[PDB]
Design a protein around this nucleic acid. Structure first.
Ligand SMILES: [Mg+2]
Ligand SMILES: [Mg+2]
Ligand SMILES: [Mg+2]
Ligand SMILES: [Mg+2]
Ligand SMILES: [Mg+2]
Ligand SMILES: [Mg+2]
Ligand SMILES: [Zn+2]
Lengths: 191, 77, 52, 189
RNA sequence: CAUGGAAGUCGGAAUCCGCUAAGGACUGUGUAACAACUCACCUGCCGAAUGUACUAGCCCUGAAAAUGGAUGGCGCUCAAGC
């Protein structure tokens, strides 16, 4: 079973610009610019209407057509991200031993780095380098919050996963020792 | 308020299923107090309701409250 | 002590999971088939029993 | 689909017998409201609404029993009910408008208009002052009663109401929502 | 009906009708018990397929031995495989 024609459309708001060349997408708007390369997928791009982009695959199989929506949702996420940004929230959870962190400022480059001390009462100092373009803040709204913000969802989420994955308990029952840092809510910078 | 005569004092620790009551116009007369509180049109539905309400008692003798309510053959009042 | 909402938040990542019966792999709570290849994508799963 | 079969003949019986049809736009209304309005109009008129009849009126349009049925084809959009009655149009203009309930907030309901608490004495138990201090409302306890010295804005119009303010609205018996039946255009009036 | 109390929700056995497209002698939580919340169920949006078992073709798990190694070798993927 080979499918003749499968098509979807993406609207574009009247605020930003997008240009595609040789399967390389450039999106630039009020909050910056992003680049992505999609040369590994055979897709045909076209301009359906004044503000609608269409893309399609011809004579594809079910497995090939399955990947068609993935680019659509990635491009939509980039469109949202370049006009509204992204924001993740994190909480610290300890029972007895407090954990203290220090998100020091730029280290002579755009990258931020986070220092974590006193995890389950350990004297190890553990060092993490954030992806470029992501801003880390200690919240002042109320206590025990870590604020992550940025332009790209992939970098914001991966950096959050780095923070989550670096605080691990070893040789203990993790159903009893619930210590660690976890993400609790994801959203946009505006509203 | 029937319960097959007075329930002797402290005679409820064991089974207390001896609450059989007669099935007659007495229940229909007692239904007039409710007077079809929740709609029931001209109270024919309320009459069937109250008649089948004592489903544990199984009406009187062979007749059953469910059979009596299901069979629409009695007078309205 | 841990306040209940934080305890639930932390437990959601390490208590509510499915366990494969062939390779002891951790699966999402609503999974129906194991994802690992050494067991052949088996559908013999059991819930992770809680601690009490 | 026993009720579906009973719906076909019941509807066919009522459409021919009642010449007058009134359209009602009911949406997100509590069941008790239709229970009470049904009991009020039990003697005269029967109200009945159901799923959208995409082709079920088109069948009445095909045969000539009522050439005016095909004139009402585009009027059905969604969540619109019909009222069959034999009373006059003037008397049925405001009969079904009674019993407008006072719907409380639902912890975040958008208030169309700014909600304000006028200066006065609540008169309730002063043990609830922690709720007032949660929002930081200046309250003074006089004679065991909580009194709001200065008016404090609750929520801006069109903005989400805070969960604490929405909860306080329940015992304060004040809310911007008043739910009632909606009247749509009937017979190209 | 027992009942501090158990208005469905220690419990016993029953399990009906009203009005609706649907909303229960109750689907749980909750609570002294209720209420409340939810659930079931129908409708508000929608816009054409779905669900449940079985059958057989290829591929994969099941598949662990000793000097370095053999579809005869290099190599081969709309094949130079079936
Ligand atoms: Mg040990
Ligand atoms: Mg299917
Ligand atoms: Mg050969
Ligand atoms: Mg060929
Ligand atoms: Mg050859
Ligand atoms: Mg061949
Ligand atoms: Zn497995």
């Amino acid at each position: 079973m080979r499918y003749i024609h499968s098509e979807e459309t993406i609207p574009v708001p009247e605020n930003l610009k997008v240009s595609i060349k040789s399967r390389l997408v450039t999106v630039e708007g009020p909050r910056g610019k992003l680049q992505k390369d999609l040369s590994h997928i055979a897709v045909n791009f076209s301009v359906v209407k004044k503000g609608v982009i269409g893309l399609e695959i011809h004579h594809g199989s079910r497995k090939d057509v399955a990947a068609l929506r993935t680019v659509r949702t990635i491009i939509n996420n980039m469109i949202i991200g370049v006009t509204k940004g992204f924001k993740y929230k994190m909480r610290y959870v300890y029972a007895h031993f407090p954990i203290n962190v220090n998100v020091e400022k730029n280290a002579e480059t755009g990258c931020y780095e986070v220092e974590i001390r006193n995890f389950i009462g350990e004297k190890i100092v553990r060092k993490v380098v954030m992806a470029p373009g992501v801003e880390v803040e200690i919240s002042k709204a109320q206590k025990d919050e870590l604020i992550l913000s940025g332009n790209s969802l992939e970098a914001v989420s991966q950096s959050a996963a780095d923070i989550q994955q670096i605080c691990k308990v070893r040789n203990k029952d993790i159903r009893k020792f619930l210590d660690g840092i976890y993400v609790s809510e994801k959203g946009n910078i505006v509203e | 308020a029937l319960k097959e005569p007075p329930r002797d004092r402290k005679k409820e620790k064991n089974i207390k299923h001896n609450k059989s009551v007669s099935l007659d116009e007495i229940i229909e007369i007692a239904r007039t107090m409710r007077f079809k509180s929740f709609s029931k049109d001209l109270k024919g539905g309320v009459k069937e309701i109250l008649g089948t309400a004592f489903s544990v008692g199984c009406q009187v003798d062979g007749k059953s409250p469910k059979a009596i309510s299901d069979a629409i053959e009695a007078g309205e009042i | 002590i841990i306040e209940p909402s934080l305890k639930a938040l932390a437990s959601k990542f390490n208590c509510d999971k499915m366990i494969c019966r062939k390779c002891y792999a951790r699966l999402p709570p609503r999974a129906t088939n194991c994802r690992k290849r050494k067991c052949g994508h088996s559908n013999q799963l059991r819930p992770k029993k809680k601690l009490k | 689909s026993g009720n579906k079969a009973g719906y076909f003949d019941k509807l066919k019986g009522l459409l021919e017998e009642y010449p007058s049809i009134f359209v009602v736009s009911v949406d997100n209304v509590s069941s008790q409201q239709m229970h009470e309005i049904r009991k009020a109009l039990r003697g005269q008129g029967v109200v009945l609404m159901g799923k959208n009849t995409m082709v079920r009126r088109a069948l009445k349009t095909f045969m000539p029993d009522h050439p005016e049925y095909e004139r009402l084809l585009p009027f059905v959009k969604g969540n619109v009910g019909f009222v069959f009655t034999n009373g006059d149009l003037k008397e049925v203009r405001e009969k079904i408008l009674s019993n407008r309930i006072k719907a409380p907030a639902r912890a975040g309901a958008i208030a169309p208009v700014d909600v304000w608490v006028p200066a006065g004495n609540t008169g309730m138990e002063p043990g609830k002052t922690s709720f007032f201090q949660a929002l930081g409302i200046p309250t003074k306890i006089a004679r065991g009663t909580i009194e709001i010295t200065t008016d404090i804005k609750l929520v801006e119009a069109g903005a989400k109401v805070g969960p604490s303010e929405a909860t306080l609205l329940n015992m304060l018996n004040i809310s911007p929502f008043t739910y009632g039946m909606g009247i749509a255009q009937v017979y190209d009036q």
